[PDB]
């Protein structure tokens, strides 16, 4: 038998008519590539970019009548890379590259097998940094959605068919993991079917989830800004008269809460509107400006001037068990009411 | 029928004289080339470099009378992007490109459409960097425009002319968000027709608009700056006579005055010259440096030495009821006078 | 005798029907090619993006008895890398590689031999950005294993097997070091078989070891979280009555322990998750925010109102004497269980 | 008439001995090629790289007389990009690239005229990564010179002469900022003409002139380090025996001039030497720091132990009302000098 | 006389059996290769990545007898550089390349000249990025020393022998800065001679040296410390009795200690290892954490309970001016042992 790379220079050769710019079945019906995807990488899912990497072995399967042969005994072939350019393959193409390549080290990493009735399968592996838009109205409580779409270029709908397989299209790598995300393990697979004024091109997609990790946001964040606020509060338990006492615990809680906010931006993300993050840091800023503007209709109380003088440091002791009570109770309203409209999202 | 990657050959080959260094129309008319860009990813807008990435497609329409059939029976051909240097094709360029590349993964991302009458159509994936210069006079409240002009290299306006076509000249995709701006939903189409010592080349521009968000910084930087001079303003009701609760109450505020502009100077960007930003973090020092300075008169006026320190002391309470209410209206007026200034803009 | 250049064009020309596309030993055992690795440079060990980028040589031997020859006489030739493509090489490559090169500057830098018997021995210098998933759980005390393992993409297990060789299979340059690592000097050499909807293919792998370095994080952040918690207790030694000396001590040494953490999430890794370090200064926190709460109940009890003052007054002083032995004793009780936990894995 | 592609297929093809490898006027006269730069964007002046980023468009003019024609009508050709290797070009490099490359989207964009008498004009586009040092030792009042130099690579200066044109040697596009300089309307044009150990080769360069903007480095840096040192001097003015308030004074004025200063060395430049802006955080620092060590000798001398008593009281009032004078007065002799020796410059 | 470009076609064409893949003197003496280098640019010295860039003029001269003629009559000849491929070159490489690539900008930047006894010469331009390990155990005061080797790749020690020429082997640019270093002018050329498993392939390297400057780490983080330390020793000549004035000079300058050790973390290098800047800001924390542990001595010696509180109060007096002559005697024993041990290395 004659070797297997100059049996597919006779199938595909000056001989037979064999044109690679021409799809199969052509002025016929469609062509029908089922395709599926497999990811090895993922990750370095920048918010200043709003994009992600991944890497994945993109293998697509069509059939091509005019590569059926039966003179050659086994059931497959398998066409070296160098000589790609003699085979039609689909155009397909991301919708939301940003920028891609191929691997070329040590060999082109292609792949092609031509089976005995004509089925092709041809796998490549590709490294995208593909675009996904995100989010970040609640940001350490958010799932972000990030799609991955695969269009066809020069070939419409009633030319060229993308699809899934019905068989694991799209599986992940075992160990792979990521610095700030988890992947969840439900992937969602369907149809877009881009129109333009060209033609109804085809494409398939694929979503992805993705839930933030909560753990690092409440030992840095959360839980050092509400030990401040509970600082504020031993103001109402020390003595009312030690003035330089109340005024030091005051500023000093503030300018605590001041370094909290502003050496934890730097660690945070940098859009142009507000957060959950940041409106946690604001109310809880106004607790802690609230205490000393106490303090300051206590020390005037009291110090305004026997019956009246009776009567007016009665009445600064009033204001200020009063506020032993209620700047617990106020606080525990809105932590109430923030984690419950951040959970319920 | 003869298949139609052979009818391109004969239509283009060595016979019928075709050359694709020759303009149509030679030695006549120019070449009406009508335009129109599909913008797929915006973003990523520098102010370091001073440039912004973009995603579109690039579509081109001329005719050529040369690529006029007749023979063969369909309304349309479509050359691969393997033939492409067969075909005269313009040279736009842009502008102010500042770095830009194709797509060639899975298949180069090209499209040629030849009709029958010989119209040309010509849609190509392109990634650009293009360099618009920014204004950063008043930070927060800025917009920004950033034009995007397509030229022409080679041919003058006596050979090429660049259009718009009038219907949807410039689309952008529906998803599409950015992390610091938004993206107004009006696009401004004029000319430029560039003028060199070579000649009168065309061009084309489309302008976009960037209303720059608001709620990050008055979060992060308008409202805690502004509490803190609110919190210099209660040394004015604490006693005159509490030295180390007036004082420790003053340098604490301008300690946490000095941390708040330092710590958010990370997050703002480097131009060298001054913000409305700048001037919101250097006047409001200007307020928590002058509640010292009035503690400073009153530490030395009532301390100076009955008639005479009756009188003192009484001067030392008039210099601190006037405080009392001109320091909140001194400050409402640069609050007026800030805000109009820069929402007027 | 005849020049090696022509006597390879002769062993490899359009005689002898030597293919480049069909593998040695061709529809009979598969080919045992036996390789090793040599590593020039190693390091830039990235968190957020998880890779490493390393510099080896890679060495791939295996046989082809169509290259043997016995008319010219010396023991070896050797291929000029300009005629590369005119020989069988396997298609290894990197089940990891996040992006790779060659290095082509002022000569490919490649190198092939061919023996008298048919043994090949091709040696080629890469570049490799390979990706390993890092576990930051206890960061400052942490091991790291990232592994590089080497498939076959398109020649399965019945047609191509990798191995490592018997004598050295993997060496690394002498003076080489990381900044924030070091590597053991004791490599794992192992399979792996990769299994997937093709057939089985091929591969080995290799194992590092990465312990990190101590001496930064002690100097830097362990030692001074450890004496802001030692100042802390110099409260209960300092006069009970000195009520501004207290509490000017409680805030200001919980503001350093704040700028202490803040400035210090810059030089730490940006994962979402709790590590070892974010624990120590979380309870390192809790210490110091206690101390201030011991004093607020003192300043109290003895503040509380002869009998019933003696009473109050003894009281408050009792449970200063015992916070003396317990902040110093619960505070070790944390100290053995944090570093028995973390030397122990 | 034939077209123009062909016509200069005659003008240089197999027949007349036109060959791209010799210069014009071989073995005769040098070569004079005039050129001129067009400069369409600038900036992103590095410190740390020491280097700019410049896109220009190159003009080349030479006569070759072997491309001289009488044939054809027209008084100008236009040669095909794609047909550039058939023209001896000059081999005009950058002396200081540190990287560059051309612009090859939608079209190469390069030019070429032959003119009728010879006369060859050659536009192209360059990116260029031009490396300028950088001289930071008095960092916001400082003039940056950054050159170009257009050296020839093979050709000696018996051979090949570049000349800047007598006509606008350079231009600069009309909206074209910067973020942190202005750059002047003046530009310097002059010859370098480099010796080797190969030969006298030819060059021109082109010396542009980088005035720092001031305003931000004032708002930002100078003015709030300059009110921390008049917080200093308040203390001179608040009673002297208010021991709490005048050390409280003291150190948080010298933790506010702490944090004004580490807070912004994440904006400045890291180079590893001293500036004028790192003098005056210095210098600025003594003065808050010389205002402790006054009280500190007021807080001895009048503690220090009727006659003696007011004998020390009497000399530690002495020395606080000389110090009322001299601390302006010795900061207005280091004000002066500072700015006269930085505007000088 | 035949023009130049056509006497190399004859002097390597197909006659005269010139081979490009064979070395001259084959099966013969070894070649003998003479290299220099001259350096342009220099620096971006990174201590993450471990490497520098550098941009060099790679010269190199051997003599091919092949290419000797005697019927052209000028003394040399210079081959274009499209036609390079037809000359034997060595196969040069940088062993610790680490990336690295040509110049193609308005010509590849090469030059080849044959002399007529077959000495020939050939000058490239290389930018490399070079890797050369760093010691940081003393950051401020260190020299780093990072090598530049040239191996040869395919052709052992018997067959290609590299050199350094005996005239200016290694020459820099003048007008050549670094942010961060200074280059001494001194170079020093010597052997590595590498073995592998493969053969002793030859190579020759050049030393160079880069002493750290020194003027910004002094004034800004040696010198702020320094009188941070002062300021702690100021306690000891204020009042004993003046308990919130000793503890608040106490804590308030362990805070400034604080913020100036983190806010200067950001301007060093990342490494995980102590350095000699790191046990300065360490010891000088000890310092100011001693003051405070001194003054609770004090607070409890004379508080504790006329013949015994004259007896406790003398010796908290005593333990007092003790401490005024220990603590700037013991600051000066480390101030001597540390700039002895760091300037002696
Ligand atoms: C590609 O897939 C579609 C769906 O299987 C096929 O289209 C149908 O084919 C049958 C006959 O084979 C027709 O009766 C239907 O009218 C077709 N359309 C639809 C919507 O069902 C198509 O034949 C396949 N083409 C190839 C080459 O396999
Ligand atoms: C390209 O567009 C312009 C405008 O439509 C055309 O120029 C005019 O053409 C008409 C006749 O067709 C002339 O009467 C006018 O004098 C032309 N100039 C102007 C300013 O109106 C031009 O013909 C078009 N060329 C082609 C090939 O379509
Ligand atoms: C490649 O390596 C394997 C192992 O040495 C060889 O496979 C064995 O070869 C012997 C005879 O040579 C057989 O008896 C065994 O059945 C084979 N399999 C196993 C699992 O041992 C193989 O021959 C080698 N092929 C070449 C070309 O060298
Ligand atoms: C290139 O420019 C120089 C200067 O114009 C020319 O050199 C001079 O040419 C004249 C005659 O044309 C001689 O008399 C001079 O001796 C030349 N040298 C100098 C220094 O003036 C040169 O001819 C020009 N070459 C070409 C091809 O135009
Ligand atoms: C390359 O350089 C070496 C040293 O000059 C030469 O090797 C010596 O050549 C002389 C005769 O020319 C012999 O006697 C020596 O035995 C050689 N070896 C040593 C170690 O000295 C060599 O000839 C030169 N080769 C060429 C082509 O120039």
Not at 36 to 59: H, K, P, Q, W
Request: neutral net charge; proline residues 5%; contains cysteine.
């Amino acid at each position: 038998p004659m070797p297997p790379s100059e049996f597919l220079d006779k199938l595909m050769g000056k001989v037979s008519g064999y044109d690679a710019r021409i799809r199969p079945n052509f002025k016929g019906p469609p062509v029908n590539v089922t395709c599926n995807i497999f990811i090895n990488s993922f990750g370095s899912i920048a918010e200043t970019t709003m994009d992600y990497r991944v890497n994945i072995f993109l293998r697509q399967q069509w059939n091509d009548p005019r590569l059926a042969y039966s003179e050659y005994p086994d059931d497959s072939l398998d066409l070296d890379p160098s000589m790609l350019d003699s085979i039609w393959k689909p155009d397909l193409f991301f919708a939301n590259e940003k920028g891609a390549n191929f691997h070329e080290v040590t060999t082109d990493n292609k792949l092609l097998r031509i089976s005995k009735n004509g089925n092709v399968l041809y796998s490549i592996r590709i490294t995208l940094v593909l675009a996904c838009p995100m989010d970040l109205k609640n940001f350490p409580m958010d799932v972000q959605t990030c799609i991955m779409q695969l269009e066809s270029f020069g070939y419409t709908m009633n030319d060229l068919i993308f699809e899934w397989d019905e068989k694991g299209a799209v599986q992940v790598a075992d160990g792979l993991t990521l610095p700030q995300f988890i992947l969840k393990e439900e992937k969602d697979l369907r149809y877009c079917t881009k129109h333009y004024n060209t033609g109804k091109f085809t494409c398939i997609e694929a979503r992805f989830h993705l839930e933030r990790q909560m753990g690092y946001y409440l030992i840095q964040m959360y839980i050092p800004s509400l030990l401040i606020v509970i600082l504020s509060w031993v103001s109402f338990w020390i003595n009312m008269d030690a003035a330089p006492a109340r005024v030091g615990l005051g500023i000093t809680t503030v300018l605590t809460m001041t370094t909290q906010s502003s050496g934890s931006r730097a660690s945070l993300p940098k859009v142009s509107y507000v957060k959950a993050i940041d409106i946690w840091m604001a109310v809880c800023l106004l607790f802690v400006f609230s205490a000393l503007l106490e303090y300051a209709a206590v020390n005037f109380i009291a110090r305004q001037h026997e019956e009246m003088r009776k009567l007016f440091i009665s009445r600064a002791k009033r204001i200020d068990t009063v506020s032993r009570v209620a700047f617990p109770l106020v606080f525990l309203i809105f932590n109430i009411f923030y984690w419950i409209t951040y959970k319920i999202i």
